[PDB]
């Protein structure tokens, strides 16, 4: 059976970004319901059960481009005093209205900290090695929920 709309597909995968492995594992998903990033589902569309392949997914079809407006300067005094504020450090944050805005520290210059509110994979292309383990039809309940059962 081929991967297509409304099929429940099991894959094994490895994810690399710029030659470094970030994740690997096995999962099942209902295809065609935005359950995985769009470029990965595009790469899976039409594959036969058993097929192994490579997929280079551009940033636009993964976590999106890097928005320059996500890079902002905040005061050092805003950070918790017991924290290490150094390049690469990640922190949970919110705006004044309580909207989540997690950040990564880019640089510290005196009492000014440059941070980045973009997702860490924004602007990055993703490289996948994938094996299609199994393809089957969805149950009516899976179709109703739009997700493969756990």
């Amino acid at each position: 059976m081929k991967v297509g709309q409304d099929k429940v597909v099991t894959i094994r995968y490895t994810l690399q970004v710029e030659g470094e492995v970030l994740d690997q594992g096995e999962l099942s998903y209902l295809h065609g319901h935005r359950n995985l990033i769009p470029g990965l589902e595009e790469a899976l569309e039409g594959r036969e059960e058993g097929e192994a392949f490579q997929a280079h997914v551009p940033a636009e079809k993964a976590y999106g481009p890097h928005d320059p407006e996500g890079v902002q300067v905040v005061p050092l005094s805003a950070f918790p005093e017991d924290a290490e504020v150094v390049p690469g450090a990640q922190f949970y944050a919110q705006d004044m209205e309580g909207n989540p805005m997690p950040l990564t520290v880019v640089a510290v210059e005196g009492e000014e900290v440059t941070v980045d509110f973009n997702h860490p994979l924004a602007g990055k292309d993703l490289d996948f090695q994938v094996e299609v383990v199994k393809v089957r039809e969805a149950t009516p309940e899976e179709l109703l929920h739009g997700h493969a059962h756990p």
């Binding site: 407006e69 902002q72 300067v73 905040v74 922190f91 949970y92 944050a93 919110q94 705006d95």
Partner: peptide
């Protein structure tokens, strides 16, 4: 944000 980040973010 343009000029407002320095006043408008709480960090936890």
């Amino acid at each position: 944000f343009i000029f407002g980040a320095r006043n408008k973010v709480h960090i936890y």
